[PDB]
Design an enzyme around this catalytic site. Structure first.
Site, short mmCIF file in Angstrom:
data_model
loop_
_atom_site.label_atom_id
_atom_site.label_comp_id
_atom_site.label_asym_id
_atom_site.label_seq_id
_atom_site.Cartn_x
_atom_site.Cartn_y
_atom_site.Cartn_z
N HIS B 28 0.87 -1.18 0.00
CA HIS B 28 0.00 0.00 0.00
C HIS B 28 0.88 1.19 0.00
N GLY B 114 -4.36 -3.49 11.44
CA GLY B 114 -4.73 -4.28 10.23
C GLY B 114 -6.26 -4.34 10.10
N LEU B 116 -9.50 -2.56 10.62
CA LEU B 116 -9.69 -1.12 10.78
C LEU B 116 -10.53 -0.81 11.99
N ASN B 182 -8.28 12.08 2.91
CA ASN B 182 -7.90 12.12 1.52
C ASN B 182 -9.03 11.89 0.46
N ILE B 184 -10.62 9.41 -0.45
CA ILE B 184 -10.54 8.20 -1.28
C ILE B 184 -10.59 6.93 -0.46
N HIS B 256 -4.25 3.00 -3.62
CA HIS B 256 -4.48 2.50 -2.25
C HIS B 256 -3.66 1.26 -1.94
N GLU B 391 -19.00 -3.45 23.81
CA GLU B 391 -18.18 -4.62 23.94
C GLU B 391 -16.91 -4.52 23.11
N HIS B 441 -23.18 -16.50 31.64
CA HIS B 441 -24.44 -16.88 30.99
C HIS B 441 -24.17 -17.72 29.78
N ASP B 449 -34.59 -15.45 28.78
CA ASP B 449 -34.22 -14.46 27.77
C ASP B 449 -34.24 -15.05 26.35
N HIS B 453 -30.08 -14.83 23.46
CA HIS B 453 -29.21 -14.75 24.61
C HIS B 453 -28.62 -16.09 25.02
N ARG B 499 -24.74 -18.89 34.66
CA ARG B 499 -25.73 -18.08 35.39
C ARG B 499 -26.20 -18.84 36.61
C1 LIG Z 1 -25.11 -6.25 22.43
C2 LIG Z 1 -25.71 -6.36 23.82
N1 LIG Z 1 -24.89 -6.18 24.85
C3 LIG Z 1 -25.43 -6.32 26.10
C4 LIG Z 1 -26.77 -6.63 26.28
C5 LIG Z 1 -27.40 -6.77 27.72
N2 LIG Z 1 -28.35 -5.57 28.00
C6 LIG Z 1 -29.72 -5.46 27.85
S1 LIG Z 1 -30.51 -3.88 28.09
C7 LIG Z 1 -28.92 -3.30 28.55
C8 LIG Z 1 -28.60 -1.89 29.00
C9 LIG Z 1 -29.72 -1.03 29.55
O1 LIG Z 1 -30.14 -0.51 28.36
P1 LIG Z 1 -31.17 0.57 28.01
O2 LIG Z 1 -31.10 0.58 26.55
O3 LIG Z 1 -30.70 1.82 28.71
O4 LIG Z 1 -32.49 0.01 28.64
P2 LIG Z 1 -33.52 0.43 29.80
O5 LIG Z 1 -33.11 -0.27 31.06
O6 LIG Z 1 -33.38 1.88 30.15
O7 LIG Z 1 -34.83 0.00 29.29
C10 LIG Z 1 -27.90 -4.35 28.40
C11 LIG Z 1 -26.49 -4.00 28.64
C12 LIG Z 1 -27.61 -6.85 25.05
N3 LIG Z 1 -28.88 -7.18 25.06
N4 LIG Z 1 -27.03 -6.64 23.86
C1 LIG Z 2 -12.41 -4.12 9.57
C2 LIG Z 2 -11.81 -4.00 8.18
N1 LIG Z 2 -12.65 -4.05 7.15
C3 LIG Z 2 -12.11 -3.97 5.89
C4 LIG Z 2 -10.73 -3.87 5.71
C5 LIG Z 2 -10.10 -3.77 4.27
N2 LIG Z 2 -9.55 -2.34 4.03
C6 LIG Z 2 -8.27 -1.82 4.19
S1 LIG Z 2 -7.98 -0.08 4.01
C7 LIG Z 2 -9.67 0.02 3.56
C8 LIG Z 2 -10.40 1.28 3.15
C9 LIG Z 2 -9.58 2.45 2.63
O1 LIG Z 2 -9.34 3.03 3.84
P1 LIG Z 2 -8.67 4.36 4.23
O2 LIG Z 2 -8.73 4.30 5.69
O3 LIG Z 2 -9.49 5.44 3.56
O4 LIG Z 2 -7.25 4.24 3.59
P2 LIG Z 2 -6.39 4.98 2.44
O5 LIG Z 2 -6.59 4.23 1.16
O6 LIG Z 2 -6.96 6.34 2.15
O7 LIG Z 2 -5.01 4.94 2.95
C10 LIG Z 2 -10.33 -1.29 3.67
C11 LIG Z 2 -11.79 -1.36 3.43
C12 LIG Z 2 -9.86 -3.87 6.94
N3 LIG Z 2 -8.55 -3.81 6.92
N4 LIG Z 2 -10.46 -3.88 8.13
O1 LIG Z 3 -31.32 -8.02 27.39
C1 LIG Z 3 -30.42 -8.59 28.40
C2 LIG Z 3 -31.01 -8.50 29.81
O2 LIG Z 3 -30.85 -7.20 30.43
C3 LIG Z 3 -30.71 -9.63 30.82
O3 LIG Z 3 -32.03 -10.14 30.86
C4 LIG Z 3 -30.46 -9.42 32.35
O4 LIG Z 3 -29.66 -8.24 32.56
C5 LIG Z 3 -29.95 -10.70 33.13
O5 LIG Z 3 -30.25 -10.78 34.58
P1 LIG Z 3 -29.57 -11.93 35.55
O6 LIG Z 3 -28.26 -11.37 36.34
O7 LIG Z 3 -30.48 -12.58 36.55
O8 LIG Z 3 -29.22 -13.09 34.48
O1 LIG Z 4 -5.98 -3.81 4.58
C1 LIG Z 4 -6.67 -4.60 3.55
C2 LIG Z 4 -6.14 -4.28 2.14
O2 LIG Z 4 -6.69 -3.08 1.56
C3 LIG Z 4 -6.10 -5.43 1.09
O3 LIG Z 4 -4.68 -5.52 1.05
C4 LIG Z 4 -6.41 -5.25 -0.43
O4 LIG Z 4 -7.53 -4.36 -0.60
C5 LIG Z 4 -6.52 -6.60 -1.24
O5 LIG Z 4 -6.22 -6.54 -2.70
P1 LIG Z 4 -6.53 -7.81 -3.71
O6 LIG Z 4 -7.95 -7.64 -4.49
O7 LIG Z 4 -5.47 -8.13 -4.72
O8 LIG Z 4 -6.52 -9.05 -2.67
CA LIG Z 5 -8.91 7.44 2.59
#
Ligand SMILES: Cc1ncc(C[n+]2csc(CCOP(=O)(O)OP(=O)(O)O)c2C)c(N)n1
Ligand SMILES: Cc1ncc(C[n+]2csc(CCOP(=O)(O)OP(=O)(O)O)c2C)c(N)n1
Ligand SMILES: O=C[C@H](O)[C@H](O)[C@H](O)COP(=O)(O)O
Ligand SMILES: O=C[C@H](O)[C@H](O)[C@H](O)COP(=O)(O)O
Ligand SMILES: [Ca+2]
Ligand SMILES: [Ca+2]
Lengths: 632, 632
Positions: B28, B114, B116, B182, B184, B256, B391, B441, B449, B453, B499
Site C-alpha cells: 500500500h 490491520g 480497521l 484524503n 478516497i 491505495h 463490547e 451466561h 431471555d 441470549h 448463570r
Molecule cells: C449487544 C448487547 N450487549 C449487552 C446486552 C445486555 N443488555 C440489555 S438492556 C442493557 C442496558 C440497559 O439498556 P437501556 O437501553 O438503557 O435500557 P432500559 O433499562 O433503560 O430499558 C444491556 C447492557 C444486550 N442485550 N445486547
Molecule cells: C475491519 C476491516 N474491514 C475492511 C478492511 C479492508 N480495508 C483496508 S484499508 C480500507 C479502506 C480504505 O481506507 P482508508 O482508511 O481510507 O485508507 P487509504 O486508502 O486512504 O489509505 C479497507 C476497506 C480492513 N482492513 N479492516
Molecule cells: O437483554 C439482556 C437483559 O438485560 C438480561 O435479561 C439481564 O440483565 C440478566 O439478569 P440476571 O443477572 O439474573 O441473568
Molecule cells: O488492509 C486490507 C487491504 O486493503 C487489502 O490488502 C487489499 O484491498 C486486497 O487486494 P486484492 O484484491 O489483490 O486481494
Molecule cells: Ca482514505
C-alpha cells in the site's frame, strides 16, 4: 384523542406489561412502563393492518430494545393481532408465542431483536429498502414510515453510529427514531459511561432532532407530527423515567430487568384508578380504542389495493413476490481455472440480471470481493449498495432488506472480517431469512497481508452456527451448484471464496454438491480417503495420484458444504468414507473429526509472505501431505 | 526545522515506502505518500528512545491504518530502531521483520493493527492506561502523549465512535488523533458512502478539533503544538492527497493497495530531486536528522530515570512490573455449590486485592457478570471501569492496557455478546498478550431471555481461535485452578461461566485441570467414558451412577479446557478415554469428535423458557442421556 383516554390506554399497557413479567417471575418492566405513553400516542399515527401483518405498505415498527417485549406483546394483543390474552399469560414460557425477546414467528413482529443496536440498524435498513421499493413500484404504492424505539444501550453500540451515518447520507426522510432517554442502565446512572451531546451527534449525521418530555401526550403528539413532515431522518429524544408509574421503583436501575413485585404493582394500580386485586385487566374504553386499529387498517389496506389495481407495476410486484429460480441459466465454468471470487462475481451478475429484487453490496471492498453488479447502477436508482467500512451495519441493514417483502440481498467482505458482522449473521440464522453472505480471501492463500488478514477459525464458527449453510466451492461449477441450493434453501448461506486461482475439477463420480460431500475419485478397496474443500481439493487429487503411483488405492471426496453432508444417510456417507479418512483444509477445523480419522489443517495464526511460500510453510504440498498420510 | 530539511525528510519516507512496495510487488503506497509530511513533522515532537522501545513514559504512536506499514517501518529504520535497511528490502516476505501489517514482534511497534478501527480504540486505551498509570505513579513519572494516525476506514467503523465516546467522557487530554482525510477509499470517492460533519461528530464527543492542510509543514507543526496544549482529547483533521508526489496516481483509488509502478516512481523521484535510477536511498541530511532521535531519546530517558530514582513510587513500579502470582491465596470452594459467575467474581476480588495492576470492567453488565471489584473504586481513582454498552471498544481498550507495561486487564460480558468483541479478542491472541475475558451466561441455562441470549456456537469459535485458552469450569475449585493456569500462561484466556448454580465436584482421581481434562470417576474395564465440561459434568456423574446401577462400568472425565487437553500425551489421553467415549455439552461442539465417538450436544438455536424446562427440551437429563449412551 384526549388525555383521559390516552392515560387509560397507557396505563393499560403498563399493567399488562407489569402483570406479565410478574406472572413469569422474569423479564423487564422498566422500559415498558417508561415507554407506555409514547406508544399510546404512536398508536394513533401507525398505519397497519392487524389482520394482515404482511401488507407491503404498512408502517414498520421496530423495538430495538427487545427487552421491552412485554410492551410490544401488549400492544399487538390490544390492537387486534393474532396474539391472545392467554398468550400474554404465557410470557417467557417454553413454546409460548410470547418469548423473552421478540421473534418473527410471533405475527406482528417485524424483526428479531435482543442484541442491542441491531434494531436501529434494522430500522435504517427498512427505510432504505422502502426507498428502493418506491424506486421500483412508485410513490403511489410505497410511502410508509419506519419507526424505531431505542434506548441508551442501543445508542452506545457502534452499529448504531454506522447505521445512522448511512441514514443521513441517503436522506432517509421516512425514518423516525425515538430514543428513550431515561438516564439509567443496568450499572446505574448513564453518566458513569456516556455524556455525548446526542443532538449534535445526530445533526452531524444529517438528522433533524426533536427533544420532548416522553410523558407529555401533547408534546409526544406534536413531535410525531413534525417528524412525519421532516426532510431528513428524524430523532426524537424523549426524556422518560424508567418504571414511570411504579412508585418506589421509578427511576431505579433495579426496575430494568426484574419483576416490580406484587406490592409495588398494587400501589401502582391504586394510584392509576385500576383495581389492585385483579390482573390482566383491559378497561373498556381502552379496549375499544386500541381495537379500532382493525377497522382502520382494513380500510387503509383496501385503499392501497385499489391503487395497486390501477398501477402499471402489478406484473413487477408479482415477479418480486414469486421469483422463479429454476429458469436461471448460470455460467458454464466447466474446465475453466478461476479464483472462486471471480466465478462468484460472474454468478452475482447473472442473478441481478434475472431477479429484479436481487441487490447488495460490499463494505468498501467491491473491487476485491468482485461484487460489482456491472451496468446496474448505484443505489437508490440502481442495485449496487456502497456500505462503506461498516460490516456490522451492512449485515443488519441487509437482514431488514430480506424481511421487507420483495428483496434478495447479499452482503460482502473478506472472510476474516466476517467477525465484524457475525452478531447480525446470527440474527439472519435465527429468523431463517434469505440473506446471502459473500466472503472472499478465505485462507492463508491471501499471502502478503499476513495473519490479521488470513482466516483460520472462521470456517468453524460458521459451520457451528445453526441455520446456516457454509459453502466453500473448489471451482466455478461447484460455485454455481452452491447458489442453486442456496436460493432454494430455507436458511441463509455463506459463500467462502478464494483470492487465488483454483484448478477446475473433473465431474463427480458419485453424489454431487447437493449432498454436501461427493466422490471425485473412487477406488476399489480404498486404503485412504482424502476429504477436502475449496482450495485444498486439487492438493488432495494430486496427492491421491502420488499415493496410487506408490501402490495405495485412494478415494478423493470434495466437501463444498459440511452442513449438507451432515444430513446424508449412513449408506451415502459409508460409500464416500473408505479406509483411513484424512481431512485436509487450510483452516483450524476440528469439526472435521466428525468424519475423518486424521485432520491436516492449520493450528496457528498465519504468516505474511508470498502465497506459495506461506502454503509451503504450513505443509500444503503433495510431498508433505503424502508423508503425513503414510505416517512417515 | 526548515522546509528544505522537512521536504527532504518527507521525501525520504515516501521513496523508501514506494521502493519497498515495489520490490515486494505487494502493499500500500498511497497512504504512506499521503502521510509522509505529517510524519516528518511529528518526528520533531515524538518523545521516544529508539534504543529502548520499552521506556514506560515514551509517547505511544499507533498507526490505525496498518496498511501504512511501509511508512512505519521506514520511520523506525531511520530513527534508529532495530530494523535494518535489508529488513526494509524484505517487506512482506516470509519470516521478515517487516510483515504486510504491523506485528509487535517488530520492536518499535506498539500494537498489532490491520483490522480497521482497532487502532483508534487501542489509542484511547493507551490514553486511559496512561491516566491510570499517572494515578498510581504520579504526574512527575507519567506525562506522555498518545498519537494515532487513522484514515476514512477507521472512522467509519463503529468501534471508532465507541472508543471516542469514552475518550470524551474521560477527558483524555493526552490523546491526539490525526485523521488522514484524503477523500478516497477502495471503492473510489469517500462521498459514495460517507458525508458526516466530522468536526461536529467529535465535538459532540468532547474533543477539540483542528483542521489543516496535511501537506503544509508549518500548519502541521502549529496544529501539533496546539494539540499538545489541549484540555480535551484532540482531533486533527488533515486534508491530504492520496499518493502525494506520485504524479498520475495522485488522488487515485488505484494507489491505495497496489504498487505505483517503476515509471511512476522514476518520475516522482525526478520531480523531488532524487536520483531515479537507484532505490532505497537515504540522503545524508535526512539520515542525520532522523537518527538524532537516538541521542535525544537517550537523554529523555535518562532524565526520567533520575526522576524515578527520586520517587516514592519505585517499590510500587517494581511490584507492577514483576507480579508474584504464586503468593496468592485463592478462595477455597471445596464442597460449595455455586454458579461459576459467583465463584469467579470472588476470585476477581482476590486478584484485585493482591495485584496492584489488576483492573477491568464489564460492558454495562457488572451486576450480572458479578465483576464489581468491591470497595476498589471507579476509574480513574479506582479499579472498576464502566465501559458502557461497547463490547468491541472495551476489548480493544483492554488490549492496549495489556500492552501499556504495568496492567493485567479483564473484559466482561455475556458469552453470547463475545461475538461483538471477537475481532479484538483475535488481536489479543495474535499478540499473545495477558488479557482475560470473562463470559458469563454460558448456555441454554440462561432460560427465559431466549435464543438471542443463549450461546450455542461460541465455545467452538473460542476453541478454534489460536493462542487462546477457553476454560469452562464445573465448580469453584476448577475456576481457581483455571485462574492459576491463566496467569502463568503465555497467551490470553477466556472464562466461560454459568448463570445458574452448579454442583460442587469431588476431588480428581487422576490428572487435574492443568491437563485440560481429568478423571472424576474411574472404573476397571470401563465400557463408556462420559466427557463433559462446565454445567454438564454433574449430569454425566449422575448418568454414570445410573449406568453402574444398570451394570455398565464407566469413566467420567471433566474437561475444563479443550486446548490444554489437546497438548497431553497419548498415554494420558488413553488412560482417560476408555471404551466408547461420549462427549456431553450444552453447545454445538463438533470439535469434541477429536476425542469422542459420540457427541450429545445442541444443534439448533435455543428456546425462551424456564431453565429446567429448556434443558429438558434439549435432552439434558439422566434418563435421556442414558438412553442415548445405550443406543435405545
Ligand atoms: C449487544 C448487547 N450487549 C449487552 C446486552 C445486555 N443488555 C440489555 S438492556 C442493557 C442496558 C440497559 O439498556 P437501556 O437501553 O438503557 O435500557 P432500559 O433499562 O433503560 O430499558 C444491556 C447492557 C444486550 N442485550 N445486547
Ligand atoms: C475491519 C476491516 N474491514 C475492511 C478492511 C479492508 N480495508 C483496508 S484499508 C480500507 C479502506 C480504505 O481506507 P482508508 O482508511 O481510507 O485508507 P487509504 O486508502 O486512504 O489509505 C479497507 C476497506 C480492513 N482492513 N479492516
Ligand atoms: O437483554 C439482556 C437483559 O438485560 C438480561 O435479561 C439481564 O440483565 C440478566 O439478569 P440476571 O443477572 O439474573 O441473568
Ligand atoms: O488492509 C486490507 C487491504 O486493503 C487489502 O490488502 C487489499 O484491498 C486486497 O487486494 P486484492 O484484491 O489483490 O486481494
Ligand atoms: Ca482514505
Ligand atoms: Ca436507559
Amino acid at each position: 384523542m384526549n388525555i383521559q383516554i390516552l392515560q387509560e390506554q397507557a396505563n393499560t399497557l403498563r399493567f399488562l406489561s407489569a402483570d406479565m413479567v410478574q406472572k413469569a417471575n422474569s423479564g423487564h418492566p422498566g422500559a415498558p412502563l417508561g415507554l407506555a405513553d409514547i406508544l399510546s400516542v404512536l398508536s394513533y399515527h401507525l398505519k397497519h393492518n392487524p389482520k394482515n401483518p404482511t401488507w407491503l405498505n404498512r408502517d414498520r415498527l421496530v423495538f430495538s430494545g427487545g427487552h421491552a417485549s412485554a410492551l410490544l406483546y401488549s400492544f399487538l394483543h390490544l390492537s387486534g393481532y393474532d396474539l391472545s390474552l392467554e398468550d400474554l399469560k404465557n410470557f417467557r414460557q417454553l413454546h409460548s408465542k410470547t418469548p423473552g425477546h421478540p421473534e418473527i414467528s410471533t405475527l406482528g413482529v417485524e424483526i428479531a431483536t435482543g442484541p442491542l443496536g441491531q434494531g436501529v440498524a434494522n430500522a435504517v435498513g427498512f427505510a432504505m429498502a422502502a426507498k428502493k421499493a418506491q424506486n421500483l413500484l412508485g410513490s403511489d404504492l410505497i410511502d410508509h414510515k419506519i419507526y424505531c424505539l431505542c434506548g441508551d444501550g442501543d445508542l452506545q453500540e457502534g452499529i448504531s453510529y454506522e447505521a445512522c451515518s448511512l441514514a443521513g447520507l441517503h436522506k432517509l426522510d421516512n425514518f423516525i427514531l425515538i430514543y428513550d432517554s431515561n438516564n439509567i442502565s443496568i450499572e446505574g446512572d448513564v453518566g458513569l459511561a456516556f455524556n455525548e451531546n446526542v443532538k449534535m451527534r445526530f445533526e452531524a449525521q444529517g438528522f433533524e432532532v426533536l427533544s420532548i418530555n416522553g410523558h407529555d401526550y401533547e408534546e409526544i403528539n406534536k413531535a410525531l407530527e413534525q417528524a412525519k413532515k421532516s426532510t431528513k431522518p428524524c430523532l426524537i429524544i424523549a426524556k422518560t423515567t424508567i418504571a414511570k408509574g411504579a412508585g418506589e421503583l421509578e427511576g431505579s436501575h433495579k426496575s430494568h430487568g426484574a419483576p416490580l413485585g406484587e406490592e409495588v404493582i398494587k400501589k401502582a394500580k391504586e394510584q392509576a384508578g385500576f383495581d389492585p386485586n385483579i390482573s390482566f385487566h383491559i378497561p373498556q374504553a381502552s379496549k375499544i380504542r386500541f381495537e379500532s386499529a382493525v377497522e382502520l387498517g382494513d380500510l387503509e389496506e383496501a385503499k392501497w389495493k385499489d391503487k395497486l389495481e390501477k398501477s402499471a407495476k402489478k406484473e413487477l410486484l408479482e415477479r418480486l413476490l414469486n421469483p422463479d429460480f429454476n429458469k436461471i441459466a448460470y455460467p458454464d465454468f466447466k474446465g475453466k481455472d478461476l479464483a472462486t471470487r471471480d466465478s462468484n462475481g460472474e454468478i452475482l451478475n447473472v442473478l441481478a440480471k434475472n431477479l429484479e429484487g436481487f441487490l447488495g453490496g460490499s463494505a468498501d471492498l467491491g473491487p476485491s470481493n468482485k461484487t460489482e453488479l456491472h451496468s446496474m447502477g448505484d443505489f437508490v436508482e440502481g442495485k449496487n449498495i456502497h456500505f462503506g467500512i461498516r460490516e456490522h451495519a451492512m449485515a443488519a441493514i441487509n437482514n431488514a432488506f430480506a424481511r421487507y417483502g420483495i428483496f434478495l440481498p447479499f452482503s460482502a467482505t473478506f472472510f476474516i472480517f466476517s467477525e465484524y458482522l457475525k452478531p447480525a449473521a446470527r440474527i439472519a440464522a435465527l429468523m431463517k431469512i434469505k440473506h446471502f453472505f459473500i466472503f472472499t480471501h478465505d485462507s492463508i492463500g491471501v499471502g502478503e497481508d499476513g495473519p490479521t488478514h488470513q482466516p483460520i477459525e472462521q470456517l468453524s464458527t460458521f459451520r457451528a452456527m445453526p441455520n446456516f449453510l457454509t459453502f466453500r466451492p473448489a471451482d466455478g461449477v461447484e460455485n454455481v451448484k452452491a447458489w442453486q441450493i442456496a436460493l432454494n434453501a430455507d436458511i441463509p448461506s455463506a459463500f467462502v471464496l478464494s483470492r487465488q486461482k483454483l484448478k477446475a475439477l473433473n465431474e463427480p463420480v458419485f453424489g454431487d454438491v447437493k449432498n454436501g460431500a461427493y466422490l471425485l475419485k473412487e477406488s476399489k478397496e480404498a486404503k485412504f480417503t482424502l476429504l477436502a474443500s475449496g482450495s485444498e481439493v486439487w492438493l488432495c487429487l494430486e496427492s491421491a495420484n502420488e499415493l496410487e503411483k506408490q501402490g495405495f488405492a485412494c478415494n478423493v471426496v470434495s466437501m463444498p458444504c459440511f452442513e449438507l453432508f451432515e444430513k446424508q444417510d449412513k449408506a451415502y456417507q459409508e460409500r464416500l468414507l473408505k479406509g483411513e479418512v484424512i481431512g485436509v483444509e487450510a483452516a483450524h477445523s476440528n469439526e472435521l473429526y466428525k468424519f475423518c480419522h486424521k485432520v491436516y489443517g492449520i493450528e496457528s495464526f498465519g504468516e505474511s509472505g508470498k502465497d506459495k511460500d506461506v502454503f509451503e510453510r504450513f505443509g500444503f504440498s503433495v510431498s508433505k501431505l503424502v508423508n503425513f498420510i503414510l505416517s512417515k
